């Protein structure tokens, strides 16, 4: 239904949009794996096979996975994101994502992303063992300072479309650089009727 947002009241929306990520956040399990090359590509720059190979490749798969679950300027964001933090076969760490951006924010994409083995790997992986906190954005988060600009894209004050979610890197570990605490955004699609997960991150 149209009004579906406006029906609702503020608890209702952020338990709805909450509920949401859950469901995909654990519509998979831990670990499972999304980009797999075999053993014989880690040799040489032979095969290859390069990275706008293996970031396509690794998006389509995920398009794959996922579907309507998340917005499309979530794979978009998340294909901006490479460019310069590019996707490759390291002689010594094998297959990997190389953090190479000056621009922190171009790694923030990254987040929900691993590698099996810290030397010569040669798969790509999923986690969903990280703690997660709804956000209080309109009233806490926004006029928070450190982060509280972060998200300049939304009204907030007049948009209901949108919802923040916190998560908490403290007492976890990854094999690539690490964040700590950042923020994603949900936004309640209107021709689906359903909320999705953009690919709207920050919060260094």
Same mark, same amino acid.
């Given at each position: 239904?149209?009004?579906?947002?406006?029906?609702?009241?503020?608890?209702?929306?952020?338990?709805?949009?909450?509920?949401?990520?859950? *469901?995909?956040?654990? =519509? !998979?399990?831990?670990?499972? %794996? +999304?980009?797999?090359?075999? @053993?014989? /590509?880690?040799?040489?720059?032979?095969?290859?096979?390069?990275?706008?190979?293996?970031?396509?490749?690794?998006?389509?798969?995920?398009?794959?996975?996922?579907?309507?679950?998340?917005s499309?300027?979530?794979?978009? *964001?998340?294909?901006? =994101? !490479?460019?310069?933090?590019? %996707? +490759?076969?390291?002689?010594? @760490?094998? /297959?990997?994502?190389?953090?190479?951006?000056?621009?922190?924010?171009?790694?923030?994409?990254?987040?929900?992303?691993?590698?099996?083995?810290?030397?010569?790997?040669?798969?790509?992986?999923?986690?969903?063992?990280?703690?997660?906190?709804?956000?209080?954005?309109?009233?806490?988060?926004?006029?928070?300072?450190?982060?509280?600009?972060?998200?300049?894209?939304?009204?907030?004050?007049?948009?209901?479309?949108?919802?923040?979610?916190?998560?908490?890197?403290?007492?976890?570990?990854?094999?690539?650089?690490?964040?700590?605490?950042?923020?994603?955004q949900?936004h309640?699609?209107?021709?689906?009727?359903?909320?999705?997960?953009t690919?709207n991150?920050?919060?260094?």
């Amino acid at each position: 239904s149209s009004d579906h947002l406006l029906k609702l009241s503020a608890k209702e929306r952020a338990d709805e949009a909450t509920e949401a990520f859950e *469901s995909w956040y654990k =519509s !998979f399990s831990n670990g499972d %794996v +999304i980009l797999e090359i075999n @053993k014989e /590509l880690l040799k040489e720059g032979s095969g290859g096979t390069s990275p706008i190979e293996l970031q396509t490749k690794l998006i389509d798969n995920l398009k794959a996975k996922f579907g309507d679950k998340v917005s499309d300027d979530f794979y978009t *964001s998340l294909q901006a =994101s !490479f460019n310069f933090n590019p %996707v +490759i076969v390291d002689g010594t @760490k094998g /297959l990997t994502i190389s953090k190479q951006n000056d621009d922190e924010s171009q790694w923030f994409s990254t987040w929900f992303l691993d590698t099996e083995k810290k030397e010569k790997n040669t798969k790509i992986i999923v986690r969903n063992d990280f703690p997660f906190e709804w956000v209080d954005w309109r009233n806490k988060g926004q006029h928070d300072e450190k982060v509280g600009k972060i998200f300049k894209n939304v009204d907030w004050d007049n948009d209901l479309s949108y919802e923040v979610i916190g998560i908490d890197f403290t007492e976890a570990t990854k094999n690539i650089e690490t964040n700590q605490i950042l923020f994603v955004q949900m936004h309640y699609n209107e021709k689906i009727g359903k909320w999705q997960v953009t690919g709207n991150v920050g919060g260094v």
